Amino acid sequence: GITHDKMYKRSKTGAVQGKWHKKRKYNLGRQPANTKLIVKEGQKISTIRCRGGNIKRRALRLSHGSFAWGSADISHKARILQVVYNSTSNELVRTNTLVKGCVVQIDSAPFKSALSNDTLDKEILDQIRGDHILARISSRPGQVGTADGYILEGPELLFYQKKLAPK
Amino acid sequence: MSKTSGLYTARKLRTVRRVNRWADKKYRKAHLGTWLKANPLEGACMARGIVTQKIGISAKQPNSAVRKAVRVQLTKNSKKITAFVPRDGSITYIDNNDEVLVAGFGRAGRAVGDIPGCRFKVIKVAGIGLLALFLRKREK
Amino acid sequence: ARGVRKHLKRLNAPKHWLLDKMGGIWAPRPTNGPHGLRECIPLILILRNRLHYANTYAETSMILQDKNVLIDGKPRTDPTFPVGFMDVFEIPKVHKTFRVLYDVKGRFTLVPIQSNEAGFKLCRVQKIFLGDKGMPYLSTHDARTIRFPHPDIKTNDTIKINLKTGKIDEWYKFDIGKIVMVTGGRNCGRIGTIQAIDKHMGSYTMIRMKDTEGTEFLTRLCNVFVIGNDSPAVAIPTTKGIRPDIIKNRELRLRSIAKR
Amino acid sequence: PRISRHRNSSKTYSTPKKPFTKPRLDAELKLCGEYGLKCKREIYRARYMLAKIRRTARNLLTLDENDIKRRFEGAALLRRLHMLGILDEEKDQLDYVLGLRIEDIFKRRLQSVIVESKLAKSVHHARNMIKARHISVGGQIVNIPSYMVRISNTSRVAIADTSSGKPGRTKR
Amino acid sequence: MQRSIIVRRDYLHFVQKYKRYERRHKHVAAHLSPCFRVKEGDIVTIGECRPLSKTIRFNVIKVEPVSEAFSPF
RNA sequence: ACCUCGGGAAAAGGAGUGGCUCUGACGGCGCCGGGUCAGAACUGGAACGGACGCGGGGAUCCCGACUGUUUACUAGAAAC
RNA sequence: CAUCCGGUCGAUCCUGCCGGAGCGCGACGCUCUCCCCAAGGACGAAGCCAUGCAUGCCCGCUCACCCGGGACGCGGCGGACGGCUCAGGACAACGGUUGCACCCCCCGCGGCGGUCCCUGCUAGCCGGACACCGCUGGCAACCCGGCGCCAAGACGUGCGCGCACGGGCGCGCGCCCCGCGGGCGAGCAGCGUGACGCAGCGACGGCCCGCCCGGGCUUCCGGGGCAUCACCCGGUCGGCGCGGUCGCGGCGCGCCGAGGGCCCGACGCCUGGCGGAGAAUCAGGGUUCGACUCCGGAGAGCGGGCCUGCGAGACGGCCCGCACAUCCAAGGACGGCAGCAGGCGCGGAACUUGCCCAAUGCGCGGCGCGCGAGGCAGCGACGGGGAGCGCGCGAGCGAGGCGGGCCCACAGCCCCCGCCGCGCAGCCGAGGGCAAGGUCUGUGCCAGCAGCCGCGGUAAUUCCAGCUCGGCGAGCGUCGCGCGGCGCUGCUGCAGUUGAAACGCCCGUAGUUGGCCCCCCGCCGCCACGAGGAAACGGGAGCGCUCCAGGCAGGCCCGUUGGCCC
RNA sequence: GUCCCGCCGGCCGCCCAGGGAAACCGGGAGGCUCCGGGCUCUGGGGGGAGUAUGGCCGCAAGGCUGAAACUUGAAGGCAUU
RNA sequence: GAAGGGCCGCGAGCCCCCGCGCCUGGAGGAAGGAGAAGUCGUAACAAGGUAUCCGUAGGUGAACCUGCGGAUGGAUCCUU
RNA sequence: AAAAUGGAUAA
């Protein structure tokens, strides 16, 4: 079931192509692993058997990620406080999905240990003294099962803040 | 004029023969498929039938003779065909409501010679060969 | 197909081994091992069919599992194990010390060589890769995965595997001036010298090869193999890569029946 | 499935394009008398071979002269004819092949070469002799008269190792 | 189209039953990024790529122009 | 289907419709209307034109083309 | 391997087709003396099936009530290959060519082989339960329950060495372009460094990397008809995320833009549509066939849905819906031969419920099993080959019997040596084509014959016999089909004044076709030669299966072969 | 002189080759089996049949496209008596 | 963490609704083709007794007839 | 000016 094969799809001129084969395990798909944050139960990540003996960590829920600074490279294990602006869909960020590529608020407290230095990314250093630092999840929870993010910096910080500034 | 004398007129040339080719009567009967449906025998060499009634068809006016024929009902497609009992005195062996084998007259379905309305022959009556019951080799 | 193919049909089986079309729809399986199906000959073919040795396939197997046979410095009791180019097929118990090399015809046949030249099996480096972490590696056609290679060897180079010693000590390049035995396509098994090597982007590099008498053969870079800088590194089959022409083949064969 | 089906077996008969011409048919009775051939098929058998032997040559005779392919393919055909003996060591050339005829091909048969020696009597007795195995090149009492004894073994042709100890006529 | 470019590869086909040739064409699809500026009627070389779409499997790696006011290239 | 090509036609036959919570569109000029629209949640015994207002439909046949008019107080028609 | 000929007339030359003639491959009729190479329920029923089989093998483990080997269980490995059909699929499968810098991969092969600390701590080796079974149970059956004993190379923890490391995450090219190698043709790759995960690996160190064998896609092309199918498509066409997958891709899923394909036939429908390598028939050019043998595909009653796994959307696996059945103790239970043999139906049509691994493979086992893959036998005039049915006037044989031998898994056959001895023809014609009576009875345009012209009305060259004779021959006729015939399809190579056929004409876009000229370069097309592409098959060199149809053999031999051109 | 020779575009009669079954064309129906300048239509024995149906166009009458089943051995061209 | 549930997906099946392909029953109506020697006229081929025939429209038991324009494939290669 | 017809089947 849940096939990814091209027989079902229409051709280039939009001509339907008749099916010549029953579906096969080589092309398969599963109900997607939407990844729920645990803001409100420890992180539990199912392990799903895959083709080739390899295994994929199904992210039913995740709570903590490794986020790294854009210049000083602090890289601190932290908590994903909340999720905003998935861009692929507004609703995914309203159901707290942690799909990779989503701005997430990370707790400032572990990464506040880096507050001592100055000339160090002043716009984010202000955000470090503020209870949340925006970061974009950079690994796929649905396959990897572990979500790590990079600190929001550079022009992207400006756009993703511009996006969250009407609020 | 066959014309189309162009290096780049192979497309036109290929189709012109394909379209005009169907016109040839022999090719048209051969591959239209109208006859594969029409043939009572279904294109089979021979087909089984049940005898419905012995009939006499007068031959063409040049050759005046009462040809003797049997109306047979094909078992496969329930078509009422007329077969000609062959040779001399053969009708006496044939009985009504009796199984029969029927095969082509050899002109390719067309009537052979002077038999009006007849296109098929009776190879076997009730299993036993018609020729055998005529040559005496196998009797009733 | 579902899973993996498990049997071999003789009619599909190759023209190079040459099996009797009659006597079995099936053929011995080129079972997995050191040499590839296109470039290998099953040992049970080189035991039963080649030397006309033991009688049946079951009988061949009984000797095989009695540990009576040796291949490439180890015994290997597999019944249809692969035997390839330069695979030292020799039996110590029969004292038959041979090696397997390609004929001018294109069927590898046994070329006799003693322990002195049976100590080392010649091979070519096809791929250099970083494997098992950052340890650079070297792979030969018979799946001989030596580890850290010598700095001089790049690729299309030649390695003297040492059998029981199993190490690389002698390295020969493919650059023009090294005698090259062709192992693919039409020439498929005759020696020569490299007239030139020519490359095209992402396309088969064509290496010119002319025999000692003359006669050109232009096989692609993958099939080309460097047997020696000059002369065989181990031995040449008694054809020396002459390739006698079609009438010449008739000439040799006609007197062959007369000799009896 | 079954190695049996991978056998190439064909037909040697070369049936005529027109089956009822009396000039040809009556000569068939005449050739049948000349070599004692049992069936029209027994002529047809060598009719195919004869025409084919001439046909292969008619290709290589008009083929590029002194060509390597012609030399190898011509060598085979001429050699076949020298050992069988239809062609000769004087002729030794592609040109002579066309002249061969079906009866000239029949000459090499054991119904014909036995007749030249006269070991087995007239072609009538001669065919009877091979079936009765009283004639052979030697050591293979031939049952089949079709055996085309080659020129080398025509001199070697002989009466059976065992002819006619309790002969059938005087057996009782 | 959006970052796409449809190309007509036209070739002559030598049928043998009639010694004559046909005239056939293939409509192919390629990705052109703002690197190259093209117009319909321009000649471009497209290289094969990891499937980039259902039909776009090519990338424009060369571009030549044509006078601003069937050729088997 | 049919057709005088306009009609038939609302053909037939289906699906949805509440409350709340939000969000894009629409203008004048930087402040200021408008009440129509799409959406998207979340929710309520499986309930939403919740009262009201408000076509049953289809296949033919016979008249008369039709919109019209008529026996006020028994015939509204195919009659005029 | 370039051929005709019967037929429209009182005759003649045509056009034009009807008829023969040959070859293939099937059905049928009558017939057939032995051998040899034998196909064989493909054919608008991929309809339905009784019965029996088609995958078991091991022994890691034994305290089974006989020996240290085991009955069974459990553990292991293979059951996905093999066998069968050909329904679907008509820009798909499928042939050649490409790429994976978008992948996955059992087994074998060779290399690698530190696994962090709280770790956890016992490695002189740990933990408990676990079938078979003991005892007791339930039903008519399938079928399992409980309690206790308990068996391991099974599991489950865990001996663990800070260049600790499964996967995954941040920062680690430049500055107009390339010109070195772990590399490549291409920035691909490795590895450090910072965080995570503490992860795979072991209680008989194996996780890994390469390799093999492959699968997943994919490029450039080839890849049925139908216009009484002309407009078509709506994740369809693109971009941008995000999922999903072994991975790339509308593969899904949001958001955006309006694309995509066509007279060079799009789209739709149709097909007694698997495709190729190949066949048949044949101067050349071809034309039809492609069920079957090898290669690729797809299906197992029909739809789906899933598990064990490295791989299966598997049916001699499961789970459902649908039909179609069974069995029943009436509560229940259990299916699926398009495997082999054999039914039943259907058709014109297609064989024994044989035996056996002995071969040739393959699985498992190193201390021989397992195989309805097959091998053999039976049936077997699809056919194909080779001798018969006398020869000679007198010499003999063989189809058989009868005993050996040999062959043989075992009988058998072949083949041998004795002893004996049964040689043995049919189907079709005889006016013409077309070969072969100017014979005789019967019968009267009746009967019949006759492919086609014709014969039969009281002299039948033609029917019904008999006599002769001709064809081919243990085969010969009769139908159905294709090809040659047939320049009756015309590219080579058709015909259009009258035989059949220039649209009444003009304008004209698709197409299709186009002067002359400009040596000396790019892209063509092209021209030639290559390289690399499966054998079979076609041919083709050699080799007396007794000839042969055959075959890769054989011989005191080229490393003896088995080539070689496709 | 409305002469003579004509030069081109037509309208025509006879016809040399040459072609064709011939009637006969010959300013082609000649330069073809010693076959190939280009483009287009159209036919494939004679009936059924321009018939049926599916369109489409037309006020209609009808036009254009266009079957098959089925039958039959001749139909037909130009000539000579 | 068993029996269960809630919700999506993948998806049979059944029913309805339309499209298509494929065959088919049927009074009665209208043809066509073949039945050894039916009835009614004689249209056409001789200027076939009214030269034939093409178009188109009208008539008539039936061939056929007549109108109006055409061809010669005519019964005319010939005439201020 | 008026005139229609002639079986079949071989000869």
Domain locations in chain D as residue ranges: 19-164
State how far the alpha carbon of A68 is from the alpha carbons of A76, A137, A154, in Å: 6, 11, 14
Q: How many Cβ atoms sit within 10 Å of the Cβ of residue E12?
A: 14
Q: Which residues of A78-102 are buried (b: 16+ CB within 10 A; e: fewer)?
A: bbbeebbbbeeeeebbeebbbbbeb
Distance CA(B96)–CA(B105), nearest Å, equals 22
Cα distances (angstroms) measured from residue C192 to each of C227, C248, D169: 10, 20, 75
b/e per residue B82-114 (b: at least 16 CB within 10 A): bbbbeeeebeebbeeeeebbbbbbeeebeeeeb
Residue C60 near residue C79, CB atoms below 8 Å: yes
* Residue D157 to residue D163: CA distance in whole angstroms: 14
DSSP label of B128: E
CA dihedral sign, ordered D103, D108, D109, D112: positive
d(CA A51, CA A35): 22
Give C172's Cβ-side CA count (13 Å radius). Answer: 21
Q: Is residue A157 part of a domain?
A: yes
Question: Contact, B98 vs B80, CB < 8 A?
Answer: no
* Residue type at C247 in one-letter notation: I
Reported as half-sphere exposure (CB side, CA atoms, 13 A), residue E60 has a value of: 22
A33, A59 contact by CB (below 8 A): yes
Q: How far is the CA of A106 from the C1' of G243 (A)?
A: 23
E57-64 contact pairs (CB < 8 A, 24+): E57/E29, E58/E7, E58/E28, E58/E29, E58/E30, E58/E31, E59/E30, E59/E31, E60/E5, E60/E30, E60/E31, E60/E32, E60/E33, E60/E35, E60/E36, E63/E36, E63/E37, E63/E38
Q: How far is the CA of B46 from the C1' of G464 (A)?
A: 29
Pairing of strands B128-129, B120-125: antiparallel
Question: Who contacts C70 (Cβ-Cβ below 8 Å, separation ≥6)?
Answer: C76, C90, C91, C92
Handedness of CA B12, B17, B18, B22 (dihedral sign): positive
Tell me which residue of A84, A69, A66 sits closest to A144, measured CA to CA: A66
Which H or E element spans position D31? helix D22-35
User: E24 in helix, strand or coil?
Assistant: strand
Q: What distances in angstroms separate CA D153 from CA B139, C161, C188, D156, one per listed residue?
A: 59, 58, 42, 4
Structure tokens belonging to residue C34: 């050191």
> Is A24 part of a structural domain of the chain?
no
E67: number of Cβ within 10 Å: 5
Residue C137, CB-side half-sphere exposure with 13 Å CA sphere = 14
Phi, psi of C44 (to 5 degrees): -75, -25
Residues A124 and A142: their CA atoms lie apart, in Å, by 29
Q: Show me where chain E is broken: residue before each gap, C-N > 2.5 A.
A: 69
Q: Is the dihedral of CA C173, C176, C181, C186 positive or negative?
A: positive
Q: Which two tokens stand for residue B137?
A: 């080799």
Q: Assess whether B62 (CB) lies less than 7 A from strand J.
A: yes
**Domain count within chain A:** 1
Å from A142 (CA) to G252 (C1')? 15
Residues ≥6 apart with Cβ < 8 Å to D115? D122, D123, D126
User: What are the DSSP calls for chain C, one per residue?
Assistant: --S-----BTTTS-TTT---SSS-SB-----SSSS-TTT-EEHHIIIIIIT--SSSHHHHHHHHHTT--EETTB----TT-EE-TT--EEBTTTTB-EEEEE-SSS-EEEEE--HHHHS-EEEEEEEEEEETTTEEEEEETT--EESS--TT--SSEEEEE-TTS-----EE--STTSEEE--STTT-S---EEEEEEEETTEEEEEEEE-SS--EE--BTTT-EEEESSS-SS---TTTT----HHHHHHHHHHHHHH-
C240, C212 Cβ separation under 8 angstroms = yes
Q: Which amino acid is at D161?
A: D
How far apart are the CA of E26 and the nearest CA of chain B, in angstroms? 16
Q: How far apart are CA B21 and CA B15, in angstroms?
A: 9
Do D33 and D26 contact (CB within 8 A), yes or no? Answer: no
* Cα C9 to the center of its chain, rounded Å: 23
> How far, in whole angstroms, is CA D21 from its chain's centroid?
25
Which tokens hold the place of C222?
């993958």
Beta bridge partners of E8: E27
3-state secondary structure (DSSP) of residue D45: helix
CA distances, E48 to each of A51, E57, E71 (Å): 28, 6, 22
Distance C215 CA to G531 C1' (A): 15
In angstroms, the Cα distances linking D63 to D9, D55, D58, D70, D80 are 30, 12, 8, 7, 19
Q: Count the residues in chain B.
A: 140
Residues in chain D: 172
Q: CB atoms < 10 A from the CB of C187, how many?
A: 25
Nearest CA among C128, C119, C162 for reference residue C148? C128
Q: What residue has token string 């040697």? A: D12
Which nucleotides in chain G lie less than 7 Å from some protein C-beta? Answer: 1-3, 17-24, 26-31, 37-40, 44, 78-84, 88-93, 98-99, 101-102, 104-113, 166-171, 181-186, 189-192, 194-197, 208-222, 225-226, 232-254, 256-257, 259-262, 264, 266-268, 272-273, 285-287, 293-300, 304-314, 346-349, 358-363, 365-368, 373-376, 383-392, 394-398, 416-421, 423, 427-428, 434-436, 445-457, 463-464, 470-474, 478-483, 486, 488-496, 502, 511-514, 523-526, 530-538, 540-544, 546-566
Gyration radius of chain A over CA positions? 20
Tokens read off for C171: 């390295």
Residues 98-157 of chain A whose Cβ lies under 8 A from any Cβ of chain E: none
Q: How far apart are CA C159 and CA C128, in angstroms?
A: 12
Give the Cα separation of A80 and A36 in Å (integer). 11
Strand J-proximal residues of B, range 1-60, CB below 7 A, are: none
Residue A127, both tokens: 């955000």
Pick the residue from chain C with its C-alpha nearest to D2.
C25
Residue closest to C76 by CA, chosen among C32, C107, C116: C32
Rounded Cα distance, C242 and C216, in Å: 12
Q: How far apart are CA B56 and CA B91, in angstroms?
A: 11
**Residue listed under structure tokens 């650059």:** C175
**If 0-12 CB within 10 Å is exposed, 13-18 middle and 19+ buried, where does residue B49 land?**
buried
| Of C134, C183, C175, C142, the residue nearest C159 (C-alpha) | C142
Q: Where are the domains of chain C?
A: 1-116, 121-171, 174-243
d(CA D98, CA D140): 33
* Side-chain-facing half-sphere of A55: CA atoms under 13 Å: 9
Question: Where do the DSSP E strands lie in chain D?
Answer: 135-136, 158-159
Angle at B3 between CA B2 and CA B6, to 5 degrees: 130
User: CA–CA distance from A67 to each of A104, A117, A119, A139, B107 (Å)?
Assistant: 10, 18, 20, 11, 92
Q: Which two tokens stand for residue A74?
A: 């602090």
Residues B130 and B100 sit within 8 Å (Cβ to Cβ):
no
CA–CA gap between residue B86 and residue B68 (Å, rounded): 8
Query: Distance between CA atoms of E65 and E39, rounded to whole angstroms?
Result: 8
CA end-to-end span of chain A, whole Å?
Answer: 43
* Residue D81 half-sphere exposure toward CB, CA atoms < 13 A: 29
Element housing B51 (H / E): strand B46-58
Kindly give, in sequence order, each residue whose CB lies less than 8 Å from that of residue C215, ignoring residues fewer than 6 positions away. Answer: C243
Euclidean distance between CA atoms D82 and D90, whole angstroms: 10
Termini Cα distance of chain E? 23
Q: For residue D47, count CB atoms less than 10 angstroms from its CB and return exposed for 0-12, middle for 13-18, buried for 19 or more.
A: buried
E-assigned strand segments in chain A = 36-37, 46-49, 55-58, 61-62, 66-68, 76-77, 80-84, 103-106, 133-137, 149-151
Place of tokens 């030697």: D138
Write out the residue range of the structural domain in which residue A85 sits.
Answer: 30-167
Task: Give me the CA A43–C1' G158 separation in Å, rounded.
Answer: 26
Chain breaks in chain C (C to N over 2.5 A) after: none
- D162 phi-psi bin (left φ>0, alpha ψ -120 to 50, beta other): beta
Question: How far from E66 is each of E41, E61, E71, CA to CA, in Å?
Answer: 7, 17, 12
What letter would DSSP give residue A12?
T
Q: Are D29 and D117 in contact (CB under 8 A)?
A: no
Phi, psi of D52 (to 5 degrees): -60, -40
* Measured distance CA(C184)–CA(C119) in Å, rounded: 26
- Specify the DSSP class assigned to residue B114: T
Strand-pairing partners, residue B80, are B73
Instruction: Label the pairing between strands E58-64 and E21-31.
Output: parallel
Bridge partner residues of B101 (DSSP): B48, B124
CB E56 within 8 A of CB E31: yes
Q: Nearest 5°: CA angle at C69, between C65 and C73?
A: 120
Instruction: Extract long-range pairs of C198-201: CB within 8 Å, 24+ residues apart.
Output: none
Ranges of H-type helices in A108-153: 108-111, 122-128
Distance CA C241, CA A106 (A): 74
Place of tokens 């003693």: C114
Cβ–Cβ < 8 Å for D13, D48:
yes
> Best mutation site among C22, C215, C248, C253 for testing chain D: the one with the most D CBs within 10 Å?
C22
Inter-residue contact A36 to A22 (CB < 8 Å)? no
Q: How far apart are CA B120 and CA B32, in angstroms?
A: 22
Query: Which of A131, A132, A125, A147 is CA-nearest to residue A74?
Result: A125
Question: Pick from D32, D58, D59: which is nearest to D46 by CA?
Answer: D32
Minimal Cβ distance to D72: which of C23, C25, C250: C250
Distance CA C234, CA E42 (A): 60
Q: Token pair of C174, please?
A: 């493919």
Q: Considering all nucleic acid strands, name the nucleotide whose C1' atom is nearest to the C-alpha of residue A95.
A: F41
Distances (CA, A) of D156 to D117, D138, D139, D151, D159: 11, 8, 11, 9, 10
Nearest in space to A57 (alpha carbons), one of A65, A49, A46: A46
CA distance E26 to E45: 15
- The C-alpha atoms of residue B2 and residue A57 are separated, in whole angstroms, by 72
Give the distance, in angstroms, between the CA of residue E28 and the centroid of all CA atoms in the same chain: 6
Cα distances from C41 to residues A69, C2, C60, in angstroms, run 60, 27, 16
Residue C14 CA to residue C106 CA, distance in Å, equals 11
D68 with D118: CB under 8 angstroms? Answer: no
Q: Which residues sit opposite C108 in a β-bridge? A: C102
